[PDB]
């Protein structure tokens, strides 16, 4: 039965996503903070899509990595075609949702992925950062404060719901993110979408710089 097939696909995708690490992304005063539990040094679950757009995902690496490459290609093509400022995170989220829905419906096995698209305002501009979560079935939701993906999210979601504070500095935001993720440096990947950057906002904080903030 088609309903039974949908149930099987949903259960498979949920089990696959729950078996991976947990990724948390929350907005702060300086933009968007990305914190992910990644023991590997080569594979990265956080990347840059465009000047003011970031990427975060959790699940099977070979799937969301391909999706990240496709999104980068789409963003670069759109930027070169019309203009760099015509590229927005909403378009990337819509394309990701459509692609994931098509994969979930037509392909033999759905992608066990959970994407997070973040967007910050341009330089010299004021706007609340935007967060988008795209699920394995194509559903897309808008989160105003934080996004938690991968693994067991309920304890982390409750911890963030209790401990979140808007306009917090980078240090406090990192502390809150790590504390909620537990519920070290060598097992965490941290990147920031710094809204104060002139053109390219994405920036990675690793090594002694990451240790200093902890």
């Amino acid at each position: 039965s088609p309903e039974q097939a949908m149930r099987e696909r949903s259960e498979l995708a949920r089990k696959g996503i729950a078996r991976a690490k947990s990724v948390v992304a929350l907005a702060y005063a300086g933009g968007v903070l990305f914190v992910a539990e990644n023991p590997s040094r080569s594979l990265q679950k956080i990347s840059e899509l465009y000047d003011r757009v970031g990427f975060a995902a959790a699940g099977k690496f070979n799937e969301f990595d391909n999706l990240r490459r496709g999104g980068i290609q789409f963003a670069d093509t759109r930027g070169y075609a019309y203009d760099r400022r015509d590229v927005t995170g909403r378009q990337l989220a819509n394309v990701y949702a459509q692609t994931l829905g098509t994969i979930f419906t037509e392909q033999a096995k759905p992608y066990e992925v959970e994407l997070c698209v973040a967007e910050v305002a341009h330089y010299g501009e004021t706007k609340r950062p935007e967060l988008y979560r795209i699920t394995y079935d194509g559903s897309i939701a808008d989160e105003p404060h934080f996004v938690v993906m991968g693994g067991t999210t309920e304890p982390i979601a409750n911890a963030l719901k209790e401990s979140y504070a808007e306009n917090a500095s980078l240090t406090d935001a990192l502390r809150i993110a790590v504390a909620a993720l537990r519920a070290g440096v060598a097992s965490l990947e941290v990147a920031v979408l710094d809204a104060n950057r002139p053109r390219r906002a994405f920036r990675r904080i690793t090594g002694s710089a990451l240790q200093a903030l902890l």
Binding site: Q44, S47, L49, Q73, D76, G79, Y80
Partner: peptide, 16 residues
């Protein structure tokens, strides 16, 4: 100039 900058940034983003 625009195409060359786009290509360089595209490679940098794709490969890290």
């Amino acid at each position: 100039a625009r195409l060359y900058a786009v290509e360089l940034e595209h490679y940098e983003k794709l490969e890290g």
